[PDB]
Amino acid sequence: AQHDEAQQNAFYQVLNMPNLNADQRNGFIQSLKDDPSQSANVLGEAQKLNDSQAPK
DSSP states (O other): OTTOHHHHHHHHHHHSOTTSOHHHHHHHHHHHHHOGGGHHHHHHHHHHHHHHTOOO
């Protein structure tokens, strides 16, 4: 976890999702902190929610 490439990438990508609002991305970040085991899952869910909220 400690400056691990997958770990920091997961956090970074959850932040860098323009279709998520603050509450959503913060929600995912907290879930990520709680469950670093579920980094991949949280990332996937965040990407899915971002994608669904895409204007086009």
